[PDB]
């Protein structure tokens, strides 16, 4: 339900269960891709426009 | 002896270009007066037009 709200998958790795004492352990392992994105996105150097010209 | 030449009127003919340029007029003073307008327009000043 969450993936199809936001578009957002993860996958399924292993699954182990495990007791102790009156517990138990249920342990899932997922794993999740992506890409990192540049965040410093700021302003640009300039704004070009006239530039010069010699042609000697 | 006489030759009416006296002329620097960049203001009557200006920024509106012109290719050609024909001076009817053997003073050397008007013909040298055109000589520095043609170049001036020739100049680096951005603001272009290459006359002759």
């Given at each position: 339900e969450f993936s199809g709200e936001h578009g957002i998958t993860f996958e399924f790795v292993s699954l182990d269960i495990s007791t102790e004492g009156d517990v138990v352990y249920i342990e899932f392992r997922f794993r999740q891709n992506y890409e990192w994105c540049e965040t410093v996105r700021e302003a640009d150097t300039t704004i070009e426009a006239g530039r010069f010209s010699i042609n000697l | 002896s006489v030759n009416p030449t006296p002329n620097d009127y960049a203001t009557v003919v200006n920024?509106?270009?012109?290719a050609v340029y024909v001076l009817s007029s053997d003073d050397t003073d008007w013909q040298e007066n055109l000589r520095d307008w043609i170049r001036s327009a020739w100049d680096c000043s951005k603001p272009q037009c290459f006359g002759h």
């Open positions: - | 920024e509106c270009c012109f």
